[PDB]
Design a protein around this ligand. Structure first.
Ligand SMILES: CC(=O)SCCNC(=O)CCNC(=O)[C@H](O)C(C)(C)COP(=O)(O)OP(=O)(O)OC[C@H]1O[C@@H](n2cnc3c(N)ncnc32)[C@H](O)[C@@H]1OP(=O)(O)O
Ligand SMILES: [Cl-]
Length: 192
């Protein structure tokens, strides 16, 4: 649970909200009423900024790798998990996010040859400390896999943490790796 100076439940009606470089405010049920979309977009930018900073602290990074500005200059896609039916039911509570995007990589296969590929990459991924290890990461990962239409073994991971390595092994049996020099991680089956 992390909170904001505005109504997160009104802004994000769905449990998982997908945003891309357009930072498009979700459509609300007819009524309603709604603040100007430019202002709703600013709210979204602030949420992404704060989520990025929170993930950086959790990962012991000196700067965020996720931000509103970087969302707008890159072709990233973020999935944001809110706590629907949070209590007390205040103005909403975001639980975490996952950010993905296609990146051109020079990948080493076994037999150690470099291959130019552009897989979908897991770029940032954070669940609030208070509720880590409760299954929310899996919720978010499963949803992303469905929307992106990809198989787990087809992914590359940008600098996975120890926690993420265990997570990927437990949920998707991604265990054996093919060593790279570019700080990305891929698993057996990536080359199928
Ligand atoms: C490319 C990247 O983004 S790299 C960085 C990934 N993000 C981070 O490391 C930030 C801090 N960690 C988190 O935000 C989360 O723990 C995530 C995103 C890695 C996983 O989400 P969670 O909600 O915790 O995972 P979820 O509950 O769905 O699944 C649990 C499994 O994840 C792994 N895991 C989660 N926390 C831990 C932990 N403290 N120690 C070891 N493994 C852990 C385990 O495999 C765990 O299963 P287990 O309890 O049976 O051992
Ligand atoms: Cl970003």
């Amino acid at each position: 649970h992390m909170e904001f100076p505005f109504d997160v439940d009104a802004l994000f009606p769905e449990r998982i909200t997908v945003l891309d470089q357009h930072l498009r405010p979700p459509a609300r049920r007819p009524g309603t009423t709604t603040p100007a979309r430019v202002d709703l977009q600013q709210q979204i930018m602030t949420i992404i900024d704060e989520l990025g900073k929170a993930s950086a602290k959790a990962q012991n990074l000196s700067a965020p790798i996720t931000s509103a500005s970087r969302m707008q200059s890159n072709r990233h896609v973020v999935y944001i998990l809110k706590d629907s039916s949070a209590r007390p039911a205040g103005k909403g509570a975001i639980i975490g996010f996952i950010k993905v995007g296609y990146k051109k990589l020079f990948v080493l296969d076994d037999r150690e040859a470099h291959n130019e590929v552009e897989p979908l990459c897991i770029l940032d991924f954070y669940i609030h400390e208070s509720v880590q290890r409760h299954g929310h990461g899996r919720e978010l990962f499963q949803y992303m896999l469905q929307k992106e239409r990809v198989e787990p073994h087809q992914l590359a991971i940008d600098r996975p943490s120890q926690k993420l390595l265990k997570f990927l092994n437990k949920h998707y049996n991604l265990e054996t790796t093919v060593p790279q020099v570019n700080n990305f991680v891929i698993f057996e089956g990536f080359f199928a």
